[PDB]
Amino acid sequence: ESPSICEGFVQASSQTLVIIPDNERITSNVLTTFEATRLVAVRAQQLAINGSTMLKKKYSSPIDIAKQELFNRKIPLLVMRCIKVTPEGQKIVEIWNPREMGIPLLD
C-alpha cells in the first residue's frame, strides 16, 4: 500500500554551513589548475553577461580580463571547499580566498 510518497521523507533536512576557522584549514593554499580554471571561467562568463571590471588595462575579451583579475588578485570570487556531509545536517566547508592564495602555471 501507499504510493511510495506518504511515508517518503524525500525532503532532505536543510543543512547548516559550518565554515572552518582560518587557522584550522588543512587544504592547499595554492589554486589547483581545476580551481583556477573554474574561477577564470566563472568570472569571464559573468563579465560576458555584465561587463563590469576592476582592471586598469582594458581588454577586448572577457577571458583576458578574468585571467588578469586572477593574476592581479582582484577576482571577486571565493573558492569554498566542502569536506563532509554529516548525518546531523551540517555541511562542513572552508572558504578560501583566490586573492590570497597562490596561482598555478596556467601558461
Partner 1 sequence: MIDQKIFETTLNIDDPTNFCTNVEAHLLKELENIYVGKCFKNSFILNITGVIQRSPCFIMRTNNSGRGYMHVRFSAVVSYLNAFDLIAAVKIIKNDSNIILGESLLTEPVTIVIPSSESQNNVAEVGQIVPVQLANSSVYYIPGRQQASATGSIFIQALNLTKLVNIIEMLLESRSKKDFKQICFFEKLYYAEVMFVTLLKEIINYLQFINDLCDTFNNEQLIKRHENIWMLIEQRK
Partner 2 sequence: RYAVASYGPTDALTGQPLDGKRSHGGLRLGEMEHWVLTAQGAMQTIIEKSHDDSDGCISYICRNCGEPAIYNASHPIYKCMNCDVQADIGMVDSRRSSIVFQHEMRAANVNITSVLSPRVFQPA
Partner 3 sequence: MYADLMTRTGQVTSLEKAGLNAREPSNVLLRMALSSPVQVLTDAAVDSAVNPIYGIAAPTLMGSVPRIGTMYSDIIMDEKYITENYK
Residues lying near partner 2 in the complex (CB under 8 A) are found at 3-5, 8, 10-19, 34, 38, 41, 89, 91
Segment interacting with partner 1, rule: CB under 8 A, options 20-28, 29-37, 47-55, 98-106: 47-55
49 binds, among partner 1, partner 2, partner 3, none (CB under 5 to 8 A by kind): partner 1
- Identity of the residue, 55 or 95, whose beta carbon is nearer to partner 2 in the bound complex: 95
Contact 31, 98 (CB under 8 A): yes
4 belongs to the binding site for partner 1 (CB under 8 A)? no
Q: In angstroms, rounded to a whole number, what is the distance separating the alpha carbons of residues 50 and 22?
A: 32
C-alpha cell at 5: 510518497
Task: Provide CB contacts within 8 A for 74, sequence distance 6+.
Answer: 54, 55, 99
